[PDB]
Amino acid sequence: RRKALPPRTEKMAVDQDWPSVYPVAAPFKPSAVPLPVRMGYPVKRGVPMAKEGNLELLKIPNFLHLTPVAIKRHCEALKDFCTEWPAALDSDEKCEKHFPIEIDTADYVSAGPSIRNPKARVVTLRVKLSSLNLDDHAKKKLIKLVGDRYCKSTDVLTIKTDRCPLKRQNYDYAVYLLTVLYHESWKTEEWEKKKTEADMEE
Amino acid sequence: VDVPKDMTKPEITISDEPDTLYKRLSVLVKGHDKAVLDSYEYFAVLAAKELGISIKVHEPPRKIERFTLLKSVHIFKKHRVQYEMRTLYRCLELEHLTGSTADVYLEYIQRNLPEGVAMEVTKTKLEQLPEHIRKPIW
Amino acid sequence: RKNIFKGRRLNIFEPQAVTEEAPETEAVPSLWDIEFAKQLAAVTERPFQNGFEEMIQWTKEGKLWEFPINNEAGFDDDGSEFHEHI
Amino acid sequence: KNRAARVRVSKGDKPVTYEEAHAPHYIAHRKGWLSLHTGNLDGEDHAAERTVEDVFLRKFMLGTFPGCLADQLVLKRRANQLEICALVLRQLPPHKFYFLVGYSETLLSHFYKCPVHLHLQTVPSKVVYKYI
Amino acid sequence: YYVDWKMLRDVKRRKMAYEYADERLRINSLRKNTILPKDLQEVADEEIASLPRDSCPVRIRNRCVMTSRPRGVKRRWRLSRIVFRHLADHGQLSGVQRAMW
Amino acid sequence: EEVVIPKKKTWDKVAILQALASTVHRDSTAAPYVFQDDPYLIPTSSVESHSFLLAKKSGENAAKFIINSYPKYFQKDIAEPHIPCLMPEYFEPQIEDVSEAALQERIKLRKVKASVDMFDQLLQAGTTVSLETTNSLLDLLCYYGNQEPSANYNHLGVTWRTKNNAERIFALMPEKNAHSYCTMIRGMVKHQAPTQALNLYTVLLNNRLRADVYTFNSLIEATALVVNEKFEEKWNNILDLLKQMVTQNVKPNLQTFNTILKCLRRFYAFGKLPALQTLREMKAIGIEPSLATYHYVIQLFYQHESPSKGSSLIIYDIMNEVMGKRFSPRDPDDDMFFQSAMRVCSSLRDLELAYQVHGLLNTGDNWKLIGSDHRRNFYYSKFFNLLCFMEQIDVTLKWYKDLIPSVFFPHSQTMIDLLQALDVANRLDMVPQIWKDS
Ligand SMILES: [Mg+2]
Ligand SMILES: [Mg+2]
Ligand SMILES: [Mg+2]
């Protein structure tokens, strides 16, 4: 009947480039790996099983396709698709000076036929109040208006939005809250003069 | 000796839209086996160094989930068999990463993700004030 | 010593400077043009020669995800801004 | 006496493979998990759908390749693609193996709406770890 | 065929609940609010009780998807306690191991 | 400001993999990726490759038959985002009512018997039918000859029949436009019935309706095949059609010139000079010749002649012109150029010429135009034999390892040529290894 051909390990060159053999992630093929590798708990007086017909070497997620020789070759080709970070934004303090708004977003990757994660719609917008144009009266009203979202020690304002289904709608809604909270802190309405001496922050 | 001459054909159209600047990018990989995550960190660090990212790697504390089930299929409630699911963590922080460099690094990282792990990315995009706030409107 | 592309030609057809300005692509597709597309593509396509080549064909076909992953891909929610929800 | 997924001692004439020779309490100590996926992590959803799909493949692969299957399957789930690794005996002609590989890849891909990879390793007989 | 007649009844019950899920929610909103007049709430109670019996969320029963055991079912895997051990002891579930500490 | 925001880079979602695909080349010892890497399933000969691969292809058809046979077992969807390429398809008409809208469904689903039966009922019902739909129905019937296409499961002589539905419906047409005549002429020429096509063209001229590009493509082939006159009479008719084409202001496509060169292969001597005239016309018009265009040129000039002085001039000019070019598919016969180019190199025994042919094949994605499996085996058969004696055995062995068995399985005669190279090179120590590889 049909016979078994000798494995290609014998015909493998000594100095051949490994990444050409495994371009993508593939399971451990005993014939395609020149390395004699043994794993499995040995018998009372014996040696661990060979690399042919062994399931223990098949369960493991191999890293033969990410060899350090291949990593340098892979990454260097990707260097075209990049742009440098501006040198003037070296210190983190300067980043706040030139960009006072930071926005946190999350993306989730999981194994399955679906990518829809309801936890990926959250948007966290944090603004340092010292970089805005609030007056003495306007800043005091904004703190009294936003409530617990403002930290008195770090002077940071955190706005978290979850109602919009998409991250782009939440991002547009989050920035909408920031601008309407600022245009409202400057409207000294008539009833504001009815301040009580127990409501004063100082 | 015989090789396909010039088998490379990608295009990178440089448009006029300003690129998106990310203050800091956080990657949190979670898995069941430490050895896979230990090797995956080395792959991520080696690729990050070559691109010039200056990343920092730290290990968040692990958490263990336990639950108890009955042993036999009838009576015998004084004998239990327990089980345990272990999720080990590993976080890779990225700082001062541009939007264009972010896209390639993440997709290269995601495609080589092992089957037994998953990850979450927290991107801290930075930008200037809104037009209404910047432009003086009372 | 004479190049085959240099010499007498047929002067019946004038040299056309430009092609059709407005192609009629938004009309009834002729059956033979569709058959021409099948014949031209079938000869060009070959069985997958490498793992990477199988990924790019799948990615165009939609079998595989578009990395980097965004969990809202393919779901634009009828293209409605946040106002129709608030 | 515990009896979960164990093969009892009967003289020294019954072959046992590596998977069957270890008690269930040796899991994550001497032998790994036959399937790996994200569903059973800490803060991940969609764990029941993966389990039922896993059981179906244990029953489909066992029936598609009658007698020629060596031991349990290994299922790896990366991105949205499903990889199935099997050990198959030298029973059917190679023409039938490629027929079943082509049949399995197309049927499962159109059933679970996800790409399927089917990798086979052929062995002359069942691998024996103890006894015999 | 589902594994048992009881399992078949649950599928019909879940299907009926889904059809009348939104209609029940709208009517149940009137009952659970005290600002509407009491006369309208009494009429709402008549209508909500006139809906088919099977279209009730409380009547939904969580069983095992394999053996349909009415109790002893983990909600995460939707499996009976016996079947869960059968799959976990063979190593067929990822990340599940015998607890030792 | 002291900060300048750099401009973003935009790329397609598949270009990132092609960047990585460039780094990895083909593997010498690896079997083709289509087949399993297991030794028991690795093909051992070129005979096995056709048997193994077609077995897998039958598997896909076998599974798709089950999917289409029982659609209700695959309607469940858990794919997010949706994948329309995995849902089951439908071939039976989704609308069982008698209406024009339902009639179009049967036309687009490659159904002929259902369409013709329904069209007759529509005509008997008295409802009007659009001319374009009538033309579309004719195109489906004309192409298959009022027959069904090739499905999974349910040469000599004129396939066209006088008693055919295509002529019957055409006469019944109340209004006949240019396209209706154009599609009828093409079908007649395709089915080896050019006598009726030429007669219809005369009627087309009387109607003062201009013919499209494809009509003149079929007419040129039709005129030569109808009669068996001499070349001079045929050439006058060929030039006559071209003059008529200019009158209607019709620009020929690439395929118009390719079929002329293919038909001129019969006149292996008298057609040499006229062939060059057509090639120069293609450059003047602007249509860049494809691989198929050069394929017919070299074969026409290549005959069983000892001097081959003309053929050598033909190939040398072409290769310099084609040097450093990446070719896109533009002709159904583009795959036959590489095999035919190697045939010329076999007789000329020019290793340097073959390397230019082989170097062109390895540039970019031009390797996909090699042809079928037997064409690939034949292309490497002639090329490898040239590598034996025309080059030193040290480099011949390197090509032997790379080309075999990764690309093709050697023939028995090819092994003989390798043995001759070893004997001439005064090296018999490799003979035991050759037998092992044999
Ligand atoms: Mg029963
Ligand atoms: Mg009450
Ligand atoms: Mg209850």
CA F287 remoteness from chain centre: 18
Instruction: Give the ligand whose atoms come closest to the C-alpha of residue E63.
Output: 3
**Phi-psi domain of D113 (left: phi exceeds 0; alpha: psi -120 through 50; beta: other):** left
> What subunits make at least 3 CB pairs under 8 angstroms with B?
A, C, D, E, F
CA distance A26 to A63: 9
HEC profile of F192-219: CCHHHHHHHHHHHHHCCCCCCHHHHHHH
Mutate one of C35, C43, C71, C77 to test the F interface: name it (highest F CB count within 10 A): C43
F257 token code pair: 């010139």
Instruction: Give the ligand whose atoms come closest to the C-alpha of residue E58.
Output: 3
Q: Determine, for residues F362 and B108 on separate chains, whether the beta-carbon distance falls below 8 Å.
A: no
Q: Determine, for residues B87 and E95 on separate chains, whether the beta-carbon distance falls below 8 Å.
A: yes
Q: Determine, for residues D113 and F83 on separate chains, whether the beta-carbon distance falls below 8 Å.
A: yes
Q: At what angle do helices F351-361 and F309-322 cross, to 10 degrees?
A: 30
- Tokens 């040995």 belong to A42
- Tokens 């076999």 belong to F346
At residue A26, what is the residue type? A
Mutate one of A8, A39, A58 to test the D interface: name it (highest D CB count within 10 A): A58
CA distance F25 to C51: 11
Nearest to F378 by CA among F339, F345, F351, F346: F339
DSSP code for F32: P
Q: Determine, for residues B108 and F16 on separate chains, whether the beta-carbon distance falls below 8 Å.
A: yes
- Tokens 């369409």 belong to F115
Q: Determine, for residues A31 and F38 on separate chains, whether the beta-carbon distance falls below 8 Å.
A: yes
What dihedral do alpha carbons B76, B82, B83, B84 form, nearest 10°?
160
A154 token code pair: 């770090």
CA distance F387 to F127: 71
DSSP code for A114: B
CA distance F8 to B98: 9
Q: How far is the CA of E7 from the centre of ligand 1 (A)?
A: 11
DSSP chain D: ---TT-----TT---B-TTTTS-GGGBTTTB--SEE-GGGSSS----HHHHHHHHHHHHHHHHHSTTTB-S--EEEEETTEEEEEEEEES-S-HHHHHHHHHHHHHHHHHHHTS-EEEEEEEESS----B--
Q: Does domain E1-91 have CATH number 3.30.565.10?
A: no
D window 65-94, beta carbon within 8 A of B = 76-79, 83
Side-chain-side CA neighbours of residue F316 (13 Å): 11
Q: How far is the CA of A117 from the centre of ligand 3 (A)?
A: 28
Q: How far is the CA of E83 from the centre of ligand 1 (A)?
A: 15
CA distance F265 to B84: 78
Instruction: Using a CB–CB cutoff of 8 Å, tell me whether C67 touches chain B.
Output: yes
D52 token code pair: 């039922």
Q: Determine, for residues D46 and A110 on separate chains, whether the beta-carbon distance falls below 8 Å.
A: yes
HEC profile of E27-68: HHHHHCCCCCCHHHHHHHHHHHHHCCCCCCHHHCCCCCCCCC
In this complex, does chain E touch chain F, defined as having at least 3 beta-carbon pairs under 8 Å apart? Answer: no
F window 311-340, beta carbon within 8 A of A = none
Report the residue count for chain A. 202
Instruction: Using a CB–CB cutoff of 8 Å, tell me whether F80 touches chain D.
Output: no
- Tokens 């990989």 belong to B29
Q: Determine, for residues B7 and F25 on separate chains, whether the beta-carbon distance falls below 8 Å.
A: yes
* Nearest Cβ partner for E78 among D4, D48, D72: D48
Q: Resolution (in Å) of the shown entry?
A: 3.6
Nearest to B68 by CA among E99, E77, E73, E76: E99
Q: Determine, for residues B85 and E84 on separate chains, whether the beta-carbon distance falls below 8 Å.
A: no
Nearest to F211 by CA among F177, F182, F240: F182
Q: How far is the CA of E61 from the centre of ligand 3 (A)?
A: 6
Beta-carbon contacts of residue A94 (< 8 Å; ≥ 6 apart): A88
Question: By the 8 A CB rule, do B130 and A125 touch?
Answer: no
Instruction: Give the ligand whose atoms come closest to the C-alpha of residue E4.
Output: 1
CA distance D103 to D111: 12
Identify how the structure was determined.
Answer: cryo-EM
Q: Determine, for residues F56 and D99 on separate chains, whether the beta-carbon distance falls below 8 Å.
A: yes
Before A86, cis peptide (omega within 30)? no
Strand A156-161 and strand A123-128: the pairing is: antiparallel
User: Which residues of chain E does D41 touch, with a Cβ-Cβ cutoff of 8 Å?
Assistant: 95
Q: Determine, for residues D94 and A2 on separate chains, whether the beta-carbon distance falls below 8 Å.
A: yes
Strand B117-127 and strand E73-74: the pairing is: unpaired
User: Which residues of chain D does C63 touch, with a Cβ-Cβ cutoff of 8 Å?
Assistant: 80, 109, 114-115
User: Which residues of chain B does D46 touch, with a Cβ-Cβ cutoff of 8 Å?
Assistant: none
CA distance B69 to B77: 10
The widest CA-to-CA distance across chain A, in whole angstroms, is 101
Q: Determine, for residues F13 and C50 on separate chains, whether the beta-carbon distance falls below 8 Å.
A: no
Q: Give, in order, the Cα–Cα distances in Å from C24 to each of A30, A72, C20, E10, F212.
A: 57, 49, 9, 57, 14
Nearest to E20 by CA among E58, E51, E64: E51
* Nearest Cβ partner for F6 among A19, A31, A84: A84
Nearest to D45 by CA among D37, D53, D33: D37
* Nearest Cβ partner for D113 among F39, F48, F77: F77
Q: Determine, for residues B120 and A107 on separate chains, whether the beta-carbon distance falls below 8 Å.
A: yes
Strand D35-36 and strand D74-78: the pairing is: parallel
Question: By the 8 A CB rule, do C11 and F280 touch?
Answer: no
Sign of the alpha-carbon torsion through D26, D31, D34, D35? positive
D51 token code pair: 């389990």
A window 33-72, beta carbon within 8 A of D = 40-41, 43, 49, 52-56, 58-61
Partner residues linked to D119 by β-bridges: D85
Q: How far is the CA of E74 from the centre of ligand 1 (A)?
A: 21
Strand E79-80 and strand E97-98: the pairing is: unpaired
Nearest to F345 by CA among F373, F380, F376, F369: F380
Q: Determine, for residues B100 and F9 on separate chains, whether the beta-carbon distance falls below 8 Å.
A: yes
Nearest to D31 by CA among A39, B86, A36, B87: A39
Instruction: Give the ligand whose atoms come closest to the C-alpha of residue E41.
Output: 2
- Tokens 């002891």 belong to E89
DSSP A14-46: SS--GGGT-SS-----GGG--S----SPPPTTS
Instruction: Using a CB–CB cutoff of 8 Å, tell me whether A200 touches chain C.
Output: no
Q: Give residue limits of the domains in chain E.
A: 1-91
Partner residues linked to B27 by β-bridges: B92, B121
